[PDB]
Amino acid sequence: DGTEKWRFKTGKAIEASPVIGEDGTIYVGSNDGHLYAINPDGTEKWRFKTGKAIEASPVIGEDGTIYVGSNDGHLYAINPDGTEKWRFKTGKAIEASPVIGEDGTIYVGSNDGHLYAINPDGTEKWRFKTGKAIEASPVIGEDGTIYVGSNDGHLYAINP
Amino acid sequence: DGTEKWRFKTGKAIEASPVIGEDGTIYVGSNDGHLYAINPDGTEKWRFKTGKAIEASPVIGEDGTIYVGSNDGHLYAINPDGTEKWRFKTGKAIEASPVIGEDGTIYVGSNDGHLYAINPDGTEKWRFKTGKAIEASPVIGEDGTIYVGSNDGHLYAINP
């Protein structure tokens, strides 16, 4: 009927789409800097604070790890209980959601122009420089190709 | 290996993620106003011009229809052959990608503050009003609940 079930208030605007875990938990980032874990009944499970606003949607690894990019420049890996697993610093704000390859590699674009491939342990695999800031989340093709849009006007097909 | 396979040039910045169809076709919206269909070898299959920039990712329905929101306020339904199927006008620009429910309903947020439920034939099912613009795509839970964030700071859970 399109009627409200509940609402959860954050500190500032929510520009990022939520993501749902296997247990039904709804994770959503806000412009107040936090990644909120919301129970399906609208109550807060926990919150994780980053340096600045979170504009990008989080993605969930196969083991339950929640990866989210913050405007503070980091890609955060957060355990299912709300504790930080690791963080990877890029040059500028991360406005785009990460995406996970079939081998566990976490790909994310940064406003510093680079597409980053990050190992599941937080160490850098490689980086590729597009012309300008990357605001679009990358998408993986069936053969492993990583497609990423850049502010330089191009869509790049990157070998894995 | 982090090397470039190919690049596809549009007229302006690509702020939105692409999406891949069943046959490997890559669809991406550009700030130049066009939805591009790109073959896996990097050559253009076709383009469809909307009125303003497209900063939201397209989504693909079960029958291959590509839905894309534009800054001109419309949610376009484009056939796989590049011809428009229908369009749905909202009050303000659409900056968020739509999402498709199990029953085929297409949910899209608009800068007019509403989350719209659109039947596959282009007619409105219902609209859910929030306090401010919706720049974030919605997500659907296993029980059919639709979650969407708003610029009013709230995460809304909405019954189908």
The string of DSSP codes covering B94-113 is --S--EE-TTS-EEEE-TTS
Pairing of strands B146-149, B154-158: antiparallel
Cα–Cα distance between A94 and A53 in angstroms, integer?
10
Q: B128, A4 in Cβ contact below 8 A?
A: yes
Beta carbons within 8 Å of A7's beta carbon, 6+ residues apart: A42, B154, B155, B156, B157
Tell me which amino acid residue B89 is: K
Alpha-carbon Rg of chain A, whole angstroms? Answer: 15
Beta bridge partners of B147: B139, B157
Q: Which run of H or of E encompasses B46?
A: strand B44-49
Diameter of chain A measured on Cα atoms: 48
Tokens linked to A70: 């913050």
The residue among B3, B5, B39 with the most chain A CBs within 10 A of its CB, best to mutate, is B5
Q: What is the 3-state secondary structure (H, E, C) of A73-97?
A: CEEEEECCCCCEEEEEECCCCCCCC
Q: A71, A95 in Cβ contact below 8 A?
A: yes
For residue B137, which residues of chain A lie inside 8 Å, CB to CB? 17, 57
Question: Is A160 within 8 Å of chain B by CB?
Answer: yes
Nearest-CA neighbor of B98 among B157, B19, B32, B22? B19
Cα–Cα distance between B57 and B61 in angstroms, integer?
13
For residue A136, which residues of chain B lie inside 8 Å, CB to CB? 14-18, 57
Question: Is B39 within 8 Å of chain A by CB?
Answer: no
Q: Other CB atoms closer than 10 Å to residue B122's CB: what's the count?
A: 14
Cα–Cα distance between A94 and B155 in angstroms, integer?
21
Q: Kindly report the nearest CA distance between residue B48 and chain A, in angstroms.
A: 17
Q: How far is CA B156 from CA A22, A160, B90, in A?
A: 20, 37, 20
Cα–Cα distance between B53 and B34 in angstroms, integer?
7
The residue among B25, B154, B159 with the most chain A CBs within 10 A of its CB, best to mutate, is B154
Q: B53, B12 in Cβ contact below 8 A?
A: yes
At residue B5, the 3 state secondary structure works out as strand
Place of tokens 């690791």: A86
Sheet hosting strand A84-89, strand order edge to edge: A59-60, A66-69, A74-78, A84-89
Q: Do A20 and B142 touch (CB under 8 A)?
A: yes
Place of tokens 């989080």: A58
Alpha-carbon Rg of chain B, whole angstroms? Answer: 15
Provide the experimental method for this PDB entry: X-ray
Cα–Cα distance between B108 and B95 in angstroms, integer?
9
Beta carbons within 8 Å of B16's beta carbon, 6+ residues apart: A136, A149, B28, B29, B54, B55, B56, B57, B58, B97
Q: Other CB atoms closer than 10 Å to residue B45's CB: what's the count?
A: 15
Q: Do B153 and A57 touch (CB under 8 A)?
A: no
Give DSSP secondary structure letters for B114-155.
Answer: EEEEE-TTS-EEEEEE-SS---S--EE-TTS-EEEE-TTSEE
Closest-CA residue of B relative to A114 is: B2
Q: Do A7 and B149 touch (CB under 8 A)?
A: no
Q: B43, B15 in Cβ contact below 8 A?
A: no
Q: If contacts are CB pairs under 8 Å, which of residues 48-107 in chain A contact chain B?
A: 57, 96-97
Tell me which amino acid residue B67 is: Y
Tokens linked to A47: 């919150």
Q: How far is CA B118 from CA B88, B100, B128, in A?
A: 8, 9, 12
Cα–Cα distance between B47 and A38 in angstroms, integer?
40
Nearest-CA neighbor of B3 among A158, A98, A146? A158
Backbone angles phi, psi at B116, to 5 degrees: -100, 135
Cα–Cα distance between B3 and A31 in angstroms, integer?
34
Q: How far is CA B65 from CA A34, A87, A121, B90, in A?
A: 36, 38, 39, 20
Question: Is A47 within 8 Å of chain B by CB?
Answer: no
Residue A72, CA atoms < 13 Å, CB-side half-sphere: 18
Give DSSP secondary structure letters for A85-154.
Answer: EEEEE-SS---S--EE-TTSPEEEE-TTSEEEEE-TTS-EEEEEE-SS---SPPEE-TTSPEEEE-TTSE
Burial B66-90 (b: 16+ CB within 10 A, else e): bbbbbbbbbbbbbebeeeebbebeb
Q: Do B128 and A159 touch (CB under 8 A)?
A: no
Domains observed in chain B:
19-158 (2.40.128.630)
Backbone angles phi, psi at A146, to 5 degrees: -100, 120
Diameter of chain B measured on Cα atoms: 47
Q: Number of residue pairs across A and B with CB atoms under 8 Å?
A: 190
